[PDB]
Design an enzyme around this catalytic site. Structure first.
Site, PDB file in Angstrom:
ATOM      1  N   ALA A  15     -79.475  51.802  28.007  1.00  0.00           N
ATOM      2  CA  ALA A  15     -78.640  52.810  28.979  1.00  0.00           C
ATOM      3  C   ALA A  15     -79.187  54.919  29.393  1.00  0.00           C
ATOM      4  O   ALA A  15     -78.405  54.842  29.474  1.00  0.00           O
ATOM      5  CB  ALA A  15     -77.358  52.569  28.042  1.00  0.00           C
ATOM      6  N   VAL A  62     -85.988  46.529  21.360  1.00  0.00           N
ATOM      7  CA  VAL A  62     -85.731  44.764  21.136  1.00  0.00           C
ATOM      8  C   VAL A  62     -86.654  44.248  21.534  1.00  0.00           C
ATOM      9  O   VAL A  62     -86.263  42.526  20.851  1.00  0.00           O
ATOM     10  CB  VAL A  62     -84.621  44.751  23.027  1.00  0.00           C
ATOM     11  CG1 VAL A  62     -83.640  45.632  23.220  1.00  0.00           C
ATOM     12  CG2 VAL A  62     -86.694  44.472  24.034  1.00  0.00           C
ATOM     13  N   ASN A  88     -79.568  44.948  29.559  1.00  0.00           N
ATOM     14  CA  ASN A  88     -80.313  45.378  30.815  1.00  0.00           C
ATOM     15  C   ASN A  88     -82.256  45.977  30.225  1.00  0.00           C
ATOM     16  O   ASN A  88     -82.300  45.606  31.302  1.00  0.00           O
ATOM     17  CB  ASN A  88     -79.914  47.071  31.008  1.00  0.00           C
ATOM     18  CG  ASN A  88     -80.291  47.336  31.351  1.00  0.00           C
ATOM     19  OD1 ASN A  88     -80.289  47.378  33.506  1.00  0.00           O
ATOM     20  ND2 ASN A  88     -80.473  48.898  31.511  1.00  0.00           N
ATOM     21  N   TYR A 153     -93.205  39.126  35.162  1.00  0.00           N
ATOM     22  CA  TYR A 153     -92.370  39.843  35.462  1.00  0.00           C
ATOM     23  C   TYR A 153     -91.308  38.392  35.736  1.00  0.00           C
ATOM     24  O   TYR A 153     -89.965  38.170  35.554  1.00  0.00           O
ATOM     25  CB  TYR A 153     -92.140  40.726  36.033  1.00  0.00           C
ATOM     26  CG  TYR A 153     -90.998  41.337  37.069  1.00  0.00           C
ATOM     27  CD1 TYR A 153     -90.215  42.393  35.402  1.00  0.00           C
ATOM     28  CD2 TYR A 153     -89.915  41.381  37.902  1.00  0.00           C
ATOM     29  CE1 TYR A 153     -89.088  43.212  35.331  1.00  0.00           C
ATOM     30  CE2 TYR A 153     -88.698  41.591  37.768  1.00  0.00           C
ATOM     31  CZ  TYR A 153     -88.827  43.117  36.663  1.00  0.00           C
ATOM     32  OH  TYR A 153     -87.830  43.463  37.213  1.00  0.00           O
ATOM     33  N   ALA A 154     -92.195  37.685  37.073  1.00  0.00           N
ATOM     34  CA  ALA A 154     -91.412  36.906  37.440  1.00  0.00           C
ATOM     35  C   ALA A 154     -90.634  35.239  36.253  1.00  0.00           C
ATOM     36  O   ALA A 154     -89.654  34.947  36.631  1.00  0.00           O
ATOM     37  CB  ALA A 154     -91.148  35.715  39.033  1.00  0.00           C
ATOM     38  N   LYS A 157     -87.508  36.486  34.053  1.00  0.00           N
ATOM     39  CA  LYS A 157     -86.397  36.950  34.893  1.00  0.00           C
ATOM     40  C   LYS A 157     -86.040  35.350  35.430  1.00  0.00           C
ATOM     41  O   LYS A 157     -84.816  34.973  35.092  1.00  0.00           O
ATOM     42  CB  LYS A 157     -86.781  37.637  36.013  1.00  0.00           C
ATOM     43  CG  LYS A 157     -86.704  39.236  35.314  1.00  0.00           C
ATOM     44  CD  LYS A 157     -86.007  39.796  34.575  1.00  0.00           C
ATOM     45  CE  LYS A 157     -86.287  41.320  34.688  1.00  0.00           C
ATOM     46  NZ  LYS A 157     -84.778  42.137  34.014  1.00  0.00           N
TER      47      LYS A 157
END
Ligand SMILES: NC(=O)c1ccc[n+]([C@@H]2O[C@H](COP(=O)([O-])OP(=O)(O)OC[C@H]3O[C@@H](n4cnc5c(N)ncnc54)[C@H](OP(=O)(O)O)[C@@H]3O)[C@@H](O)[C@H]2O)c1
Ligand SMILES: NC(=O)c1ccc[n+]([C@@H]2O[C@H](COP(=O)([O-])OP(=O)(O)OC[C@H]3O[C@@H](n4cnc5c(N)ncnc54)[C@H](OP(=O)(O)O)[C@@H]3O)[C@@H](O)[C@H]2O)c1
Ligand SMILES: NC(=O)c1ccc[n+]([C@@H]2O[C@H](COP(=O)([O-])OP(=O)(O)OC[C@H]3O[C@@H](n4cnc5c(N)ncnc54)[C@H](OP(=O)(O)O)[C@@H]3O)[C@@H](O)[C@H]2O)c1
Ligand SMILES: NC(=O)c1ccc[n+]([C@@H]2O[C@H](COP(=O)([O-])OP(=O)(O)OC[C@H]3O[C@@H](n4cnc5c(N)ncnc54)[C@H](OP(=O)(O)O)[C@@H]3O)[C@@H](O)[C@H]2O)c1
EC number: 1.1.1.100
Lengths: 246, 247, 247, 246
Positions: A15, A62, A88, A153-154, A157
């Site tokens: 954040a 994380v 996020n 990354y793809a 996600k």
């Protein structure tokens, strides 16, 4: 009374800037007690500065189970259990496949996919006990469209959506919804990176003719977090200016 | 406040006498819109006027009748200055297995559920382009994406709504108009109340949430897409189905 | 004839000892390919050699072990000149509800079902680029698209296979390589034979075709995508599920 | 024995040129008895010329129920009932929405969507009696992606998929599969129309770097028509060079 989160505790990972900051700010505006995270203590304090009496920042990695456990304990202590989890935090390690290192693959799996497993599991017992909860993953249009030089990354996600759908099936009858918001290209530190030709070329693929704003992602996340979105689960809400239409 | 605020916007919500459309209309009015809701009958149009009060009015509209469309839109333009938010909610079913499906059951559905979206959307577009701001939100169905035995006509119309939505979205995005579909799962209304007890039990068994949705839950999704806050969402289908189907 | 003909092509099919992979290997050999099928054991590798005969050979491969990958690919290159068609079929389950899911159950799946696709695909790509022709076909699952309770790890890996496939497809399309996923529904194999009687009955109830699929039915879809005739298909997911899910 | 259609009767609507011609030729190569259609008697004869002893051409207007009935009766008479229906006939009536005429909307609904209803219904009784059949609709990437100036065509092609999924659900347990093949941009008379800038711009959206060939659509249709594709139903097989990835 529309979109009211008073009484809810929200954890927003990553954040400190851009999308995650916008999310944390809007959730606080809508009445949640918000815990935003950064990877450093100074980053955590910057989050506490902007949240003021609406919540607090904490340091969280994380990819580290001990960090996750410590952070959730601190939240439970000071605020009570997490009612809304926004996953996020996320990174890129771009390269064509021919140049992609094992570490670039693994860093993306750990940070962008495995994290979602670990955090979701860690907040779920509380949500199932109360029979109410929200988990909202920040995906990417790249998860749906694919993109050259972002196969890692793809994958991550896209994997987030398969995880989300399966979790949604397990927890729906106990009042927990699990959804993804998939941004298109949003004006942030991920983007100002792109050079001018690349920016122009990205924009030409967007019917809206502009990059998105972080606030636009925050609004979508806040909507899914609301009581009014109780009948939405297992869904991907695309916020991309028409870059891809599913 | 200015959050999800529709003050100053004129909304036309077709089929607002009951069900999902009524809930849409009531919520858009709560959010500050001037709302025109429609029914096929004058009693329904007056009932809409009655529940909207100072926030709007009801009009009779049959979305299969171009003269009715023209008359309603002129009334709205003459009084309120024309439509900023169009919610294409009016729709019907004419269920049958394909081998029993009549030509008129096919055509009634194309006309009411698909051609209506073309006609109404075209008729409001000029005004929205001029203002450089607009919202069109079509009410689709999970059936458009999943298919359903006995509803090949309905499914074709609802799937076709999305194809139209995507194309129109590409045409009008650069002039400030977004075009999107909200696709409900099974929602407690007169349309659902159609099903027998066995069929209802079997439908609920397919829904992870373990209940039908409420009309208000569709209204919330529509209100969100109608808002200034949803300006970067276009060409999208927002599924509100309790997990019955997951895309 | 020259229809769906794979003569002159070298195919590597991972996990060809049984199930879907065995059927893939047998069909690709029928279509003229030189096939290398793999098992995790030497007995399985010899069984593959035995059924392939003059059409190919079996090798031991663990797709979670980069040294094993390197050794197998070198053997294939040294003898046969390297891989023209890669079928990433090897995969496992480690089912559990999320609240019971162990860290090792998550990691075993990421490694076996997702990272394996990255490693194998990267390792064959240079040779395919050089030849300006190649096929990579990943075996996904309906679960990657639909989700399934008790399989959040499996679903995440199988969904992630598609994300990878789309990205790689965009990278290599202009150099003659296609990259696609075949996503089976429930297929009669040892993995399915896992389910108890109640669970199997309940799974069949979800399939419009009213049966499980046959491994040969997945092999046919793979053989089609491997063919010269499928050169304009890339970045696609071909669903073979009896109607269990419809995209 | 792979992909063998010997013994099957196939009807390919709009088989005079381009995709439909390629489909009709390949199905005949694979052993089917093929009936291809055109809107004129001379068009029908040109189809009979290329099919020779593998089938015949017939005149059919798929917007006219009496034509549909006459054609199916003639087929049943000479060949027996239709085992494989390929709904390929289709048109465009392009315009921006602002300029789109009521007749341009209706001509597209009639020709591209309602036709599929009418023909599918008309062949289904025979297929259900035998407990075996194939219906394959020729869709378009535009049905999935949308395209400016083609809102009518996109509606119709998308509607075809919703129709297909529902029909697939009704007929699957009786051995009939219903699927769509969705071409990208294919070199045909629909395309040679585009001017040079438009061609270049279409190609730039295709990873493969070329338009498709009609034979490439024929191969996909022949695969779905085969016994080997019995476990595929309700599916859309995209053949678009990567123009869109679902
Ligand atoms: N920007 C875009 O166009 C775009 C588009 C689509 C999707 N997304 C997704 O949106 C999310 C946010 O993106 P953004 O553009 O706003 O990114 P950003 O500007 O790079 O911020 C990333 C955040 O994640 C945190 N983070 C990184 N690694 C972490 C770890 N191991 N543990 C905990 N936190 C970590 C960072 O912490 P520090 O501040 O301490 O470094 C930071 O707050 C990501 O999931 C991204 O993939 C972004
Ligand atoms: N489970 C569900 O109920 C469900 C699920 C998904 C999608 N939907 C869609 O949601 C929409 C609303 O459905 P609902 O369940 O609320 O339906 P409903 O209770 O049957 O209400 C239908 C509304 O549409 C109006 N209408 C019907 N035909 C019309 C016509 N020719 N011209 C103008 N208005 C007409 C009706 O007016 P009158 O009152 O005058 O008859 C009524 O206001 C429909 O598009 C439906 O397909 C429903
Ligand atoms: N219903 C279904 O069966 C179904 C549905 C959808 C997708 N799939 C997918 O289809 C694929 C094949 O499945 P199946 O049902 O045929 O499975 P199976 O009968 O369990 O066969 C698995 C194959 O993979 C090999 N394998 C397992 N772990 C491996 C490893 N670490 N390294 C290399 N090889 C390994 C096995 O070798 P050994 O014989 O030596 O153990 C075997 O040859 C999998 O990717 C599966 O997820 C299956
Ligand atoms: N070309 C492409 O890039 C492309 C891409 C995606 C999808 N498609 C789809 O592929 C299909 C074939 O397209 P194509 O490009 O090869 O088209 P085409 O060259 O224009 O041929 C169209 C065929 O349909 C027939 N037809 C037109 N109206 C008819 C009617 N009312 N009744 C019966 N037949 C009729 C024509 O008959 P006549 O010869 O007698 O005129 C002709 O044989 C269409 O569904 C199209 O939408 C095409």
């Amino acid at each position: 009374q529309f979109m009211n989160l008073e009484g809810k505790v929200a954890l927003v990972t990553g954040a400190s800037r851009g999308i995650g900051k916008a999310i944390a700010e809007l959730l606080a505006e809508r009445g949640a007690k918000v815990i935003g995270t950064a990877t450093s203590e100074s980053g955590a304090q910057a989050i506490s500065d902007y949240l003021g009496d609406n919540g607090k920042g904490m340091a969280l990695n994380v990819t580290n189970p001990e960090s996750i456990e410590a952070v959730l304990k601190a939240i439970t202590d000071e605020f009570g259990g997490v009612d809304i989890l926004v996953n996020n935090a996320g990174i890129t390690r771009d390269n064509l496949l021919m140049r992609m290192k094992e570490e670039e693959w693994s860093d993306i799996m750990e940070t962008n996919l495995t994290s979602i497993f670990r955090l979701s599991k860690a907040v779920l017992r509380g949500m199932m006990k109360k029979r109410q909860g929200r988990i909202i993953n920040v995906g990417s249009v790249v998860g749906t469209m694919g993109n050259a030089g972002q196969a890692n990354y793809a994958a991550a996600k896209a994997g987030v959506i398969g995880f989300t759908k399966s979790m949604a099936r397990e927890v729906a009858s106990r009042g927990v919804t699990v959804n993804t918001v998939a941004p298109g290209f949003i004006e942030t530190d991920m983007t100002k990176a792109l050079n001018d030709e690349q920016r122009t070329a990205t924009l030409a693929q967007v019917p809206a003719g502009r990059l998105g704003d972080p606030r636009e992602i925050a609004s979508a996340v806040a909507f899914l977090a609301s009581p009014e979105a109780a009948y939405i689960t297992g869904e991907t809400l695309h916020v991309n200016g028409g870059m891809y239409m599913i």
